[PDB]
């Protein structure tokens, strides 16, 4: 007898039998080795889609520059994807777009955007993902790379007194005018660097391999920018964020289910006696190699035509930094002999000298990228990689979906980052061929390539949008990640309640039927118990922590009031996922047990749930033996100074401590201010006030010298 797990779909829908076809349960694919070939494939594949050879020599950069707009060599293979944008075509689509809703659309959205730019502090730049620090040329978090950048500013020329967005951006543009920039290398020496190398270094974007992406056979290279591009990209993402929040044919901020009900219900009431509707799920392929930032310079030059003078020049810089970006090419490759015994390492620097030690595919990809190579990097001027403008290309999708050609046959739909759903209304099937080929015509002219392999359509709603397969009546949910249930791992108290918070937030947002919640709650309970070696008292487990609990169980009177971390049973349920375990169990505890556990005089916690099991695990051992020990001394000094500033201002972690004078001067003026206020209504004694005054004056002469 054979067996087939797919036969349930003979008498079901694709809204129940679609979670069976996700392998979201097993190990994700990781990358191994270098990520150079992926960068060569992305950059060389970008130049292959440029459809031109029109090169322009450069005076700033020592490398040639190829244009990407209005220079087309029309091949016969037009079904192959192109990377060429006609600017008058897309500006005609912009003028056709603003004539659909309102008159002062871009002025209103731009005045809201500039209304939110001027009330922004640059510490929002520290609330981001990992960035590229060019001081040691590594990948660092945002606060560390920003602090090394400000360290380079205050070390190079003068100090920094900005504390705003615009003065920090003007500080970076001031750094572009400096003839020499001094910073620190590693044991903390001070080095210097010129002017053109600072231009080559400020526009350097690091590429690596995307780890943990479910759904691809071949891997892909993701890119992380530096620090001098991030605030301008924040400006453009706020402008396009307000444009996408104001429009009604987009789904990025999120409801994504009501909009499709309003356009399916609304556009089915716009039919004649013979017309009908066919929807098509598409998937735009090669989306990160066909969006050139020069069209962003044209449209962002068109939106801010009447906004201000600051915004008109402030929203025209991040495309100019995207038109000349460098690409880190990984770290090279490895060679070996015939016996496969000795294996040398060739980095990305000496790849030009060691050119004759490569394969056929490496030389085919390398000879098509050679007249654009720097020593370490590559010069890309038409790509838009991952980790960049996402709310701006969706506006181009809305510009494609609002085309008006003058019958009564047209289209509408919904747009995402690279997923569109298109609704077509026409009368006959060759007219359907005319309208669909007009949609591929307008997308092909504007610069959006639909994939012909991953696209289909039907007459009623049986479409696909962001992995939610919508049938004729019902809605399937997003198959959520199973590892998100247990990712706290910090405490015996902030694991089970955090897991109940994850079950609650996955219950409200997604479907997450109750037996799945009780099963996931009980499995996360078992992984908590197996992780922290704590078992129930009636079990037969005998380890080094259940001997004490089994020995001292006779002192506890009420046995079901003990914590789960101390050998108790389960009392939380689905209707108690907002109440923690301790607060639920404190109505039944013994007074010796409750007064014993919750004692703040404990050797573990001393030096959001109740802190009574909160301990700190020990640190590593190889963190003080490498060459980066003095950096741990620097974070030690940072925590000392932060403990000092916490010791001066008794309420500093609640409000954002703005100010632009100094830290120690507000400390000294604060101790003098509270010394006078607590002096005249308080102290009154000559030796204490004269002694504190003597320590402030001696500390001021010590600090100033």
């Amino acid at each position: 007898m054979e067996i087939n797990p797919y036969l349930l779909m003979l008498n079901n829908d694709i809204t129940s039998m679609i979670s069976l076809t996700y392998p979201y349960t097993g190990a994700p694919p990781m990358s191994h080795g270098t990520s150079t070939k992926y960068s060569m494939e992305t950059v060389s594949r970008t130049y292959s889609y440029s459809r031109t050879k029109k090169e322009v020599p450069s005076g700033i950069f020592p490398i040639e520059r190829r244009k990407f707009c209005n220079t087309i060599e029309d091949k016969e293979n037009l079904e192959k994807p192109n990377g060429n944008v006609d600017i008058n075509f897309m500006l005609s689509l912009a003028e056709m777009l603003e004539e659909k809703m309102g008159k002062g659309f871009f002025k209103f959205c731009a005045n809201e955007a500039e209304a939110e730019i001027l009330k922004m502090h640059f510490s929002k730049l520290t609330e981001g993902r990992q960035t590229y620090d060019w001081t040691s040329e590594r990948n660092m978090p945002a606060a560390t790379a920003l602090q090394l950048t400000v360290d380079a500013i205050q070390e190079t020329q003068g100090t920094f007194k900005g504390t705003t967005m615009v003065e920090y951006c003007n500080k970076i543009l001031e750094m572009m005018d400096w003839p020499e920039v001094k910073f620190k290398k590693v044991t903390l020496m001070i080095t210097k660097i010129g002017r053109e190398e600072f231009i080559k270094r400020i526009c350097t974007i690091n590429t690596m391999a995307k780890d943990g992406e479910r759904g691809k056979y071949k891997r892909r290279a993701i890119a992380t920018p530096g620090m001098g591009i991030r605030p301008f990209s924040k400006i453009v993402e706020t402008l396009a964020q307000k444009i996408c929040e104001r429009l009604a044919e987009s789904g990025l901020p999120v409801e994504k289910k009501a909009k499709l009900k309003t356009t399916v219900s609304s556009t089915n009431s716009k039919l004649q006696e013979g017309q009908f509707m066919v929807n098509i799920t598409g998937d735009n392929s090669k989306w990160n190699e066909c969006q050139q930032p020069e069209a962003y310079l044209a449209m962002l030059a068109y939106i801010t035509k009447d906004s201000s003078n600051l915004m008109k020049d402030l929203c025209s810089v991040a495309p100019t930094l995207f038109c000349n970006k460098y690409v880190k090419m990984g770290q090279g490759f490895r060679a070996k002999n015939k016996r496969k015994t000795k294996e040398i390492v060739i980095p990305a620097k000496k790849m030009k000298e060691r050119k004759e030690l490569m394969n056929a595919e490496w030389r085919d990809l390398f000879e098509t990228i050679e007249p654009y190579m720097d020593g370490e990097c590559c010069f890309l001027g038409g790509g838009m990689l991952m980790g960049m403008f996402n709310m701006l290309s969706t506006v181009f999708g809305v510009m494609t979906l609002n085309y008006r050609e003058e019958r009564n046959c047209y289209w509408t739909g919904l747009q995402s980052s690279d997923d569109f759903v298109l609704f077509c209304i026409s009368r006959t099937w060759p007219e359907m061929e005319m309208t669909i080929l007009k949609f591929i015509a307008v997308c092909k002219l504007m610069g959006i390539n639909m994939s012909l392999e991953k696209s289909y359509g039907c007459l009623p709603e049986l479409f696909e949008f962001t992995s939610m397969f919508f049938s004729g009546d019902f809605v399937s949910n997003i198959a959520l990640e199973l590892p998100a249930f247990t990712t706290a791992g910090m405490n015996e108290g902030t694991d089970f309640t955090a897991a109940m918070s994850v079950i609650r937030t996955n219950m409200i947002n997604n479907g997450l039927s109750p037996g799945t919640a009780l099963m996931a709650l009980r499995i996360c309970l078992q992984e908590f118990r197996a992780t922290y070696r704590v078992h129930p008292y009636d079990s037969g487990v005998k380890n080094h922590r259940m001997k004490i609990i089994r020995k001292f169980i006779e002192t506890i009177e009420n046995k079901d009031g003990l914590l789960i971390s101390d050998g108790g049973k389960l009392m939380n349920n689905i209707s108690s996922l907002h109440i923690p375990e301790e607060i639920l169990k404190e109505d039944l505890m013994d007074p010796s047990y409750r007064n014993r556990v919750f004692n703040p005089r404990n050797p573990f916690t001393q030096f959001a749930v109740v802190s009574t099991h909160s301990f700190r695990t020990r640190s590593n051992r190889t963190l003080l033996n490498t060459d980066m020990r003095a950096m741990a001394l620097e974070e030690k000094r940072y925590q000392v100074v932060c403990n000092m500033y916490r010791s001066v201002f008794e309420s500093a972690d609640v409000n954002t401590p703005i100010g632009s004078m100094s830290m120690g001067e507000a400390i000294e003026a604060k101790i003098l201010d509270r010394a006078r206020t607590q002096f005249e209504n308080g102290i009154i004694g000559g030796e204490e006030y004269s002694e504190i005054k003597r320590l402030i004056e001696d500390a001021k002469r010590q600090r100033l010298s």
């Binding site: 409200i508 907002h578 974070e635 409000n655 201010d673 509270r674 500390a699």
Partner: protein, 249 residues
């Protein structure tokens, strides 16, 4: 007498040579980017390193002088609780945690704990005194709304709360004087008669003030009535294919 201690600490930290180039060179806001110097990348496997931590014999950093006052070096059969390897901080085992939880001293602090967490004990008191009924088994579904989800009686909008905690706890560097003060300053006259003498720290006080004054408004799928009292009962009352509600009062 605390200003003499702060004078000894501030005079102590200016004695260092390379630390004088740290302060009085930056800005007040740079304290925020002085707070974060997390040189680790992401801590991408927290539970994995936690299970690797709990598998050893002494994973915990514990204080010495508190645990030596009442603790015992070894338990009644070979259970190790102590080390002599290294600030004076001693590694330890979680058997000392459960041994402290079963064979340790006790300090009566039920009033403080039952006064810090008044919102969550209010959630338990409102949860225990409700009644349910039968189910319905019907199709249900509605759009997403922005709902204040806590039964507060003040209803501030996340702007008078930070400013309120500035003008109650520590007024020496609080805020510029706005027009949002007056009746909330009568509320300051009410609040200073409460938080004047307590053993509660000002961070814990600023924590517990912000949970009785802030209606937590989120963007959630709601259906039926939009009363806030049944908004912690949101995930329990109905899902997508089922619904249960018979609440009389």
């Amino acid at each position: 007498s605390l200003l003499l201690t702060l004078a000894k600490e501030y005079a102590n930290l200016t004695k260092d040579k390379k630390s004088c180039k740290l302060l009085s060179q930056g800005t007040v806001s740079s304290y925020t980017t002085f707070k974060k110097w997390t040189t680790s990348r992401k801590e991408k496997n927290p539970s994995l390193r936690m299970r690797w931590a709990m598998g050893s014999k002494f994973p915990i950093m514990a204080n010495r002088e508190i645990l030596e006052e009442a603790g015992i070096p070894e338990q009644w059969e070979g259970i190790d609780l102590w080390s002599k390897k290294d600030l004076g901080m001693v590694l330890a085992s979680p058997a000392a945690i459960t041994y402290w939880n079963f064979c340790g001293p006790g300090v009566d602090n039920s009033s403080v704990i039952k006064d810090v967490y008044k919102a969550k004990f209010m959630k338990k008191e409102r949860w225990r005194e409700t009644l349910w009924g039968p189910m319905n088994f019907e199709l249900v579904g509605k759009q997403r709304r922005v709902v204040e989800t806590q039964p507060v009686e003040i209803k501030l909008n996340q702007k008078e709360i930070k400013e309120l905690t500035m003008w109650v706890l520590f007024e020496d560097e609080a805020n510029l004087a706005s027009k949002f003060i007056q009746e909330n300053f009568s509320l300051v006259l009410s609040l200073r008669e409460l938080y004047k003498g307590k053993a509660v720290n000002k961070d814990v006080a600023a924590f517990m003030i912000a949970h009785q004054f802030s209606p937590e408004k989120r963007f959630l799928p709601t259906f039926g009535p939009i009363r806030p009292e049944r908004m912690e009962l949101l995930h329990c009352l109905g899902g997508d294919f089922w619904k249960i509600e018979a609440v009389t009062a």
